[PDB]
Amino acid sequence: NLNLFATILTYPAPASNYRGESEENRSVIQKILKDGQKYAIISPESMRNALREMLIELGQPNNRTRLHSEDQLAVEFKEYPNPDKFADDFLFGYMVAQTNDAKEMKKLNRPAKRDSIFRCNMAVAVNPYKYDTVFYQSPLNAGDSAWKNSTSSALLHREVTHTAFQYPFALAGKDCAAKPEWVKALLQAIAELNGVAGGHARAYYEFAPRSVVARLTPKLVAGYQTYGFDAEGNWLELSRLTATDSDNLDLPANEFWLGGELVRKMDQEQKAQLEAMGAHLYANPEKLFADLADSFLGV
Amino acid sequence: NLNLFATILTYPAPASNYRGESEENRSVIQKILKDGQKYAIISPESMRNALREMLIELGQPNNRTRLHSEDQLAVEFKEYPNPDKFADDFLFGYMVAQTNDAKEMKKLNRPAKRDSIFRCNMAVAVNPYKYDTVFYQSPLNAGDSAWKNSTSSALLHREVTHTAFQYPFALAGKDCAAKPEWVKALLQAIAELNGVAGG
Amino acid sequence: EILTLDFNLAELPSAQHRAGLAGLILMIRELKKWPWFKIRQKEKDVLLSIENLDQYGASIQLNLEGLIALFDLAYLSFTEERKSKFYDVITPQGGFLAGWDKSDGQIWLRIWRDMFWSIIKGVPATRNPFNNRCGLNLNAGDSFSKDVESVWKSLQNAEKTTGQSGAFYLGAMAVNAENVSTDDLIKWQFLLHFWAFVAQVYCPYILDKDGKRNFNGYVIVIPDIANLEDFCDILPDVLSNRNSKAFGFRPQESVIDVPEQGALELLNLIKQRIAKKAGSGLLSDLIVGVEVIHAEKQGNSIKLHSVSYLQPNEESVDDYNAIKNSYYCPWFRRQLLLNLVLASQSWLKRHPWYGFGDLLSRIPQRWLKENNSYFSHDARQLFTQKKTREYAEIVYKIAQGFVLSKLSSKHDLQWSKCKGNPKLEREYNDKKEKVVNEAFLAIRSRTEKQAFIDYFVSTLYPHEFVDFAQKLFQDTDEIRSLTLLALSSQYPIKRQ
Amino acid sequence: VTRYLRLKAPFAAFRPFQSGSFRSTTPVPSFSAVYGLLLNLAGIEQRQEVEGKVTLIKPKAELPKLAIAIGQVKPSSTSLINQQLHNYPVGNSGKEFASRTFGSKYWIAPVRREVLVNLDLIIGLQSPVEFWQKLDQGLKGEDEIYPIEKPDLASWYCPLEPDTRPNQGACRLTLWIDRENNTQTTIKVFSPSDFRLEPPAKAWQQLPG
DNA sequence: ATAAACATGGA
DNA sequence: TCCATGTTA
């Protein structure tokens, strides 16, 4: 009687997102001092925007468009979200209007104020930044054209790196049962994420699922904490395999299925026989999420 | 309705990209870290330029060319004659100012920004290299007919390495406006991709 | 009419109000020293009296004419002529500061005046009070009281609520995530009209491609007062004990590099004065906290950059007193201030400044490193300001041995003989330059866990004492930093 | 106190109450936020949730009575990770802005703010048996938090008097705030005390809410 | 290199 | 409420 939540990881590839805050003639990316080192990060807002973009791409109706305007970035094509259906897919439906639609006298619907479903965390890298730098040609557009030229040509430089990202869902409750079809579509959209960051078309980075593993009974999250993991290793495996071997009877491994994409290639039989005969199938994320939805329709 | 993307590689041979960003006496190539080792890079701008060049060569309508006759290199046909009606691959070049061709509204109703149909990525090697590899030599001067008068008289060095490298690319799916011959010609140009290098 | 106001320092929500109390008290004290003030007192029956001045509270008694006189003195202003490539610009007088800035040309005041136009009154609609009092002669009996009456009406019931305007230099009318308005007291809003005269101002800057300082905005320093009577007694001489040397059209001391530098500077002046002025408690007993604001104007809008709270600890003051000794500190070694911050008490001792010092030095100053040696890089950090200490010293020995031995093996010319004869120093020095910079750039790139140690073959090319690989193979960064920085010690000294 | 429980979290943010155009943060959460978090974790819904331009109109007549302290184990640093967040304009609000009126929130403008690298808290609650029982039922009944009360003791906080100059104290703090015209909360400054011993009775504060 | 995207109190 | 305006060493 809950909503399951998990953690995803991405295949390594060069970074794309330049996070502005440019100083002198260089573009940089924000860092965090996790243990005195550098790490590239992404705010959850970009993932929310990209997921809504995939929802509109799949054909699910919505009532909001962010279109490329010539003057300044803005969002339009939105009307009063009177029904919870046909709008915003049961999430992110804010409103702060001071005088609107006779409040509820003729709206006759809930204010939809300070409401959210599927609150997601923010992405973190797994490898420290080594102070890389790649220079940049950047010649002037023209010396004779009618259009301007910035009066000169410069020589820029930007930094890139290759690093995977991990990302938790943090979706719980049971109120999201009005539209199970919408839930399945949203799960498929997450499974089919690509170009989540707004970084740039060239050198594009895409978030494909890679060994997404987490589950729990109708109790609040604990145990693995979604972070504190090593890089390009078996953090999934080492962490939860060790915990479950220590907690085979303490926590139910039947509902909390297997972990790690590498163990799908070797020692799968030994781990399965030592732990349980549960629904620990792991071949591809697509069919995995398919059976998650199959088991979730009943709950 | 249908998307496509592929990763392609080539045959081994010495390096070709050269920029000399470090110094006059020592030339270096771009270097990237990977699992503690080092690898070579070919930036996507070079492939964009090469694709533009082959689209020039394959008898396709063009909206950009160089001059190679200026003290500092620039582009002329991209910005001077063309109001950006139809780019090479619908790239629809952008630039911001107080106005652009009468605010680019009345004369030609197009957005200021661009389309960016193509989707490329950085090219990376497959095996690491290691430090300096070859010597070099330079002359003293012209001597009698004094027109150059460099008077350098130095023995510089060059950096070479043998590696075959690969790179991915992707294409948009639902783009079909004026596609039938444009996109297939672009694909045919990709098929060869001959003249790309830093030198 | 007679009105009495009582204030307690504990009830103030922000340190700005605490500064406002001191500013108002200093305003009254300075105003009590003018012949025209007492002339108006004896003519129009002006009431102004501080009743209970102590450490914990304050009491004031005043009439309407007292408020008129205070607003006449505070909002005094005049007009100044500046040229263009002509126009009139109204400039505030500056109040009691005009009587304390003994620097030539009152250059400090100028900066203060500039700041008052930059951030204080960015919205021109708030410039009305200075427009009315332009050119007025208080010695000739000129006065203005139209706006004073409204303030008097409001102060008649100070306990009533009101709305915060932009006169508070932080936040907006409601921040306006939604329509919220704001809460404040009329008496509290009155206090904010005078704290701007106590704040300290410094000019930050950035470095361009050519290394020139480009100044942007200002840094405002606000003290937190613990004992009011002590503070108001000590500040008049603290201001008077400032330096007077000017760089260009700005004071040399006015130039700072980081927002926290000015906070240290102010309390350093306070610590100088506590030795100069006795009878008071420690700096903690005087100042509880320091507030630093970074601001800059952009068009018709005002943007903030950094807000922070500091601590008055003296052990950091002792360390900071060392940096000013070195003359013309380079902006790279200057970054030593950044690493000043049971975990981070002794983090400075490892000097892990190679990374960020190299990052900026690469881009525009790899070209400029040959220019003036940035005053010998403060003798290359004063030559490390002179077995882990022996581990640091062997690097210095090895670098010098390498450069000398390699230069000798190249042509067998010795600086001992070169210094003996003239007209041959710079030919030797040019080869020294071109033999050191190439190695420095070689170590500049191609740096990682394993490849770096193979470059040590070149360092010992013309070639106990081995039981340190358990450090070299493990750190790989401290040793790299030392080999990078100490190699610049052998870089040639400037001719002058 | 009856018993206390420990928790940790990797990321969090505590905005000053109407900080301004540019946001900021404090090293430790406000007491009101902690009280609200504990009340919600037990499953106790908010006493009043009326709707209008604003909310949070809370009388104290029907509200649990309880005493809360605060603790801290490991210092944490801060970072700034943001570039934009739209607002609601003040002024003409001209052209389209007035045309749309669809829960407006238009005129997106850049702005930065701060985050905390890590966070850990130790303090619990002194409360009657029934409240603790229903809190346990809310936690377990029909990131991670668990009670390690007796061991693993660290530094604490306490209001400071005009003496005994502290170190690295919190500039401001909030006790009980309602989003209306009021006097807000009385005491602002707080001081940390470092000793591996049970916090003094001064650390415990009986919350009016 | 452009490159931009706010406030007061006034009848 | 609405509708009156301001530039440099």
Coordinates of N, CA, C and O in Angstrom, one line a residue, chain A residues 111-196:
Chain A
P111 N -8.2 24.5 -4.6 CA -7.3 25.6 -5.1 C -6.1 25.0 -5.8 O -5.5 25.8 -6.6
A112 N -5.7 23.8 -5.6 CA -4.5 23.2 -6.2 C -3.3 24.1 -5.8 O -2.4 24.3 -6.6
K113 N -3.2 24.5 -4.5 CA -2.2 25.3 -4.0 C -1.2 24.5 -3.2 O -1.7 23.7 -2.3
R114 N 0.1 24.6 -3.4 CA 1.1 23.9 -2.6 C 0.9 22.4 -2.7 O 1.0 21.7 -1.7
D115 N 0.5 21.9 -3.8 CA 0.3 20.5 -4.1 C 1.4 19.9 -5.0 O 1.8 20.6 -6.0
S116 N 1.9 18.7 -4.7 CA 2.9 18.1 -5.5 C 2.8 16.6 -5.4 O 2.4 16.0 -4.4
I117 N 3.1 15.9 -6.5 CA 3.3 14.4 -6.5 C 4.5 14.1 -7.3 O 4.9 14.8 -8.3
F118 N 5.2 13.1 -6.9 CA 6.5 12.7 -7.4 C 7.5 13.8 -7.3 O 8.0 14.5 -8.2
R119 N 7.9 14.1 -6.0 CA 8.9 15.0 -5.7 C 10.3 14.3 -5.8 O 10.5 13.3 -5.2
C120 N 11.1 14.8 -6.7 CA 12.4 14.2 -7.1 C 13.6 14.9 -6.6 O 13.5 16.1 -6.3
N121 N 14.6 14.2 -6.3 CA 15.9 14.7 -5.8 C 16.7 15.3 -7.0 O 16.2 15.5 -8.1
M122 N 18.0 15.6 -6.7 CA 18.8 16.3 -7.7 C 20.0 15.3 -8.0 O 20.4 14.6 -7.1
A123 N 20.5 15.4 -9.2 CA 21.5 14.5 -9.7 C 22.9 14.9 -9.2 O 23.2 16.1 -9.0
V124 N 23.8 13.9 -8.9 CA 25.1 14.2 -8.5 C 26.1 13.3 -9.3 O 25.7 12.1 -9.7
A125 N 27.2 13.8 -9.6 CA 28.2 13.0 -10.3 C 28.9 12.0 -9.4 O 28.6 11.9 -8.2
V126 N 29.7 11.1 -10.0 CA 30.4 10.1 -9.2 C 31.9 10.2 -9.3 O 32.6 9.5 -8.6
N127 N 32.5 11.1 -10.1 CA 33.9 11.2 -10.3 C 34.3 12.7 -10.0 O 33.7 13.6 -10.4
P128 N 35.4 12.9 -9.3 CA 35.9 14.2 -9.0 C 36.4 14.9 -10.3 O 36.8 14.3 -11.2
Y129 N 36.2 16.2 -10.3 CA 36.7 17.1 -11.4 C 38.2 17.3 -11.2 O 38.7 17.7 -10.2
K130 N 38.9 17.1 -12.3 CA 40.4 17.1 -12.3 C 41.0 18.4 -12.9 O 42.1 18.5 -13.3
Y131 N 40.2 19.5 -13.0 CA 40.6 20.8 -13.6 C 41.0 20.6 -15.0 O 42.1 20.9 -15.4
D132 N 40.0 20.2 -15.8 CA 40.2 20.0 -17.3 C 39.9 21.3 -18.0 O 39.3 22.3 -17.4
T133 N 40.4 21.4 -19.2 CA 40.1 22.6 -20.1 C 40.3 22.2 -21.5 O 41.3 21.6 -21.9
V134 N 39.4 22.7 -22.4 CA 39.5 22.5 -23.8 C 39.2 23.9 -24.4 O 38.2 24.5 -24.1
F135 N 40.1 24.4 -25.3 CA 40.0 25.7 -25.8 C 39.0 25.7 -27.0 O 38.4 24.7 -27.3
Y136 N 38.8 26.8 -27.6 CA 37.7 27.1 -28.4 C 38.0 28.1 -29.5 O 38.6 29.2 -29.2
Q137 N 37.7 27.8 -30.8 CA 38.2 28.7 -31.9 C 37.5 30.0 -31.8 O 38.1 31.1 -31.6
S138 N 36.2 30.1 -32.0 CA 35.3 31.3 -31.9 C 35.8 32.4 -32.7 O 36.2 33.4 -32.2
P139 N 35.8 32.3 -34.1 CA 36.1 33.4 -34.9 C 34.9 34.4 -35.1 O 33.7 34.0 -34.8
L140 N 35.2 35.6 -35.5 CA 34.1 36.6 -35.7 C 33.3 36.1 -36.9 O 33.7 35.4 -37.8
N141 N 32.0 36.5 -36.9 CA 31.1 36.0 -37.9 C 31.4 36.6 -39.3 O 31.4 35.8 -40.3
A142 N 31.8 37.9 -39.3 CA 32.1 38.5 -40.6 C 32.9 39.8 -40.4 O 32.8 40.4 -39.3
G143 N 33.6 40.3 -41.4 CA 34.2 41.6 -41.3 C 33.6 42.5 -42.3 O 33.9 43.7 -42.3
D144 N 32.6 42.0 -43.1 CA 32.0 42.9 -44.2 C 30.5 42.7 -44.2 O 29.9 43.5 -45.0
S145 N 29.9 41.9 -43.4 CA 28.5 41.7 -43.5 C 27.7 42.9 -42.9 O 28.2 43.7 -42.2
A146 N 26.4 42.9 -43.3 CA 25.5 44.0 -42.8 C 25.3 43.8 -41.3 O 25.3 44.7 -40.5
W147 N 25.1 42.5 -40.9 CA 24.9 42.2 -39.5 C 26.2 42.4 -38.7 O 27.3 42.3 -39.2
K148 N 26.0 42.7 -37.4 CA 27.1 43.1 -36.5 C 28.1 41.9 -36.3 O 27.8 40.8 -36.7
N149 N 29.2 42.2 -35.7 CA 30.3 41.2 -35.6 C 31.0 41.2 -34.2 O 32.0 40.5 -34.1
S150 N 30.4 41.9 -33.2 CA 31.1 42.1 -31.9 C 32.4 42.7 -32.0 O 33.2 42.6 -31.1
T151 N 32.7 43.4 -33.1 CA 33.9 44.2 -33.4 C 35.2 43.5 -33.4 O 36.3 44.1 -33.7
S152 N 35.3 42.2 -33.1 CA 36.5 41.4 -33.0 C 36.2 39.9 -32.9 O 35.1 39.5 -33.0
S153 N 37.3 39.1 -32.8 CA 37.2 37.7 -32.6 C 38.0 37.3 -31.4 O 39.1 37.9 -31.2
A154 N 37.5 36.4 -30.6 CA 38.2 36.0 -29.4 C 38.6 34.5 -29.5 O 38.5 33.9 -30.5
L155 N 39.2 34.0 -28.4 CA 39.6 32.6 -28.3 C 39.1 32.1 -26.9 O 39.8 32.3 -25.9
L156 N 38.0 31.4 -26.9 CA 37.4 30.9 -25.7 C 37.9 29.6 -25.3 O 38.9 29.1 -25.8
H157 N 37.3 29.0 -24.3 CA 37.7 27.7 -23.7 C 36.6 27.2 -22.8 O 36.1 28.0 -22.0
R158 N 36.4 25.9 -22.8 CA 35.4 25.3 -21.9 C 35.9 23.9 -21.4 O 36.8 23.3 -22.1
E159 N 35.4 23.5 -20.3 CA 35.8 22.3 -19.7 C 34.8 21.2 -19.8 O 33.6 21.5 -19.6
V160 N 35.2 20.0 -20.1 CA 34.3 18.8 -20.2 C 34.9 17.6 -19.4 O 36.1 17.6 -19.2
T161 N 34.1 16.7 -19.0 CA 34.5 15.5 -18.4 C 33.5 14.4 -18.6 O 32.4 14.7 -19.0
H162 N 33.9 13.2 -18.4 CA 33.1 12.0 -18.5 C 32.8 11.4 -17.1 O 33.7 11.1 -16.4
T163 N 31.5 11.3 -16.8 CA 31.1 10.9 -15.5 C 29.6 10.5 -15.5 O 28.8 11.1 -16.1
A164 N 29.3 9.4 -14.8 CA 28.0 8.9 -14.6 C 27.2 9.7 -13.6 O 27.9 10.4 -12.7
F165 N 25.9 9.6 -13.6 CA 25.1 10.2 -12.6 C 24.1 9.2 -12.0 O 23.7 8.3 -12.7
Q166 N 23.8 9.4 -10.7 CA 22.8 8.6 -10.0 C 21.6 9.5 -9.6 O 21.8 10.7 -9.3
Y167 N 20.4 9.0 -9.5 CA 19.2 9.8 -9.4 C 18.1 9.1 -8.7 O 17.6 8.0 -9.2
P168 N 17.6 9.5 -7.6 CA 16.5 8.9 -6.9 C 15.1 9.4 -7.3 O 15.0 10.6 -7.7
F169 N 14.1 8.5 -7.2 CA 12.7 8.9 -7.5 C 12.1 9.6 -6.4 O 11.6 10.8 -6.6
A170 N 12.0 9.0 -5.2 CA 11.3 9.5 -4.1 C 9.8 9.8 -4.4 O 9.3 10.9 -4.3
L171 N 9.1 8.7 -4.7 CA 7.6 8.7 -5.0 C 7.0 7.8 -4.0 O 7.4 6.6 -3.9
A172 N 6.0 8.3 -3.2 CA 5.4 7.5 -2.2 C 3.9 7.8 -2.1 O 3.3 8.4 -3.1
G173 N 3.2 7.3 -1.1 CA 1.8 7.5 -0.9 C 1.0 6.5 -1.6 O 1.4 5.5 -2.1
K174 N -0.4 6.7 -1.6 CA -1.3 5.9 -2.4 C -2.4 6.7 -3.1 O -3.2 6.1 -3.7
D175 N -2.3 8.1 -3.0 CA -3.4 8.9 -3.6 C -3.3 8.9 -5.1 O -4.3 9.3 -5.8
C176 N -2.2 8.6 -5.7 CA -2.0 8.6 -7.2 C -2.6 7.3 -7.8 O -1.9 6.6 -8.5
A177 N -3.9 7.1 -7.5 CA -4.6 5.9 -8.1 C -5.7 6.3 -9.0 O -6.4 5.4 -9.6
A178 N -6.0 7.6 -9.2 CA -7.0 8.0 -10.1 C -6.8 7.6 -11.5 O -7.8 7.1 -12.2
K179 N -5.6 7.7 -12.0 CA -5.3 7.4 -13.4 C -4.1 6.5 -13.4 O -2.9 7.0 -13.6
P180 N -4.3 5.2 -13.3 CA -3.1 4.2 -13.4 C -2.5 4.3 -14.8 O -1.3 4.0 -14.9
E181 N -3.3 4.5 -15.8 CA -2.7 4.7 -17.1 C -1.7 5.8 -17.2 O -0.6 5.7 -17.8
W182 N -2.0 6.9 -16.6 CA -1.1 8.1 -16.5 C 0.2 7.7 -15.8 O 1.3 8.1 -16.2
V183 N 0.1 6.9 -14.7 CA 1.2 6.4 -14.0 C 2.1 5.6 -14.8 O 3.3 5.7 -14.8
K184 N 1.5 4.6 -15.6 CA 2.3 3.8 -16.4 C 3.0 4.6 -17.5 O 4.1 4.3 -17.9
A185 N 2.3 5.5 -18.1 CA 2.9 6.4 -19.1 C 4.0 7.2 -18.6 O 5.1 7.3 -19.3
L186 N 3.9 7.7 -17.4 CA 5.0 8.5 -16.8 C 6.2 7.6 -16.5 O 7.3 8.0 -16.7
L187 N 5.9 6.3 -16.0 CA 7.0 5.4 -15.8 C 7.7 5.0 -17.1 O 9.0 5.0 -17.1
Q188 N 7.0 4.8 -18.2 CA 7.6 4.6 -19.5 C 8.4 5.8 -19.9 O 9.5 5.6 -20.5
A189 N 7.9 7.0 -19.7 CA 8.6 8.2 -20.1 C 9.9 8.3 -19.3 O 11.0 8.7 -19.9
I190 N 9.9 8.0 -18.0 CA 11.2 8.0 -17.3 C 12.1 6.9 -17.8 O 13.3 7.2 -18.0
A191 N 11.6 5.7 -18.2 CA 12.4 4.7 -18.8 C 13.0 5.1 -20.1 O 14.0 4.6 -20.6
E192 N 12.3 6.1 -20.8 CA 12.7 6.5 -22.1 C 13.2 8.0 -22.1 O 12.8 8.8 -23.0
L193 N 14.0 8.3 -21.1 CA 14.6 9.7 -21.0 C 15.8 9.9 -21.9 O 16.6 9.0 -22.0
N194 N 15.9 11.0 -22.6 CA 17.0 11.3 -23.5 C 17.2 12.8 -23.6 O 16.2 13.6 -23.8
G195 N 18.4 13.3 -23.5 CA 18.7 14.7 -23.5 C 18.0 15.5 -22.4 O 17.4 16.5 -22.7
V196 N 18.1 15.0 -21.2 CA 17.4 15.6 -20.1 C 17.9 17.0 -19.8 O 17.1 17.9 -19.6

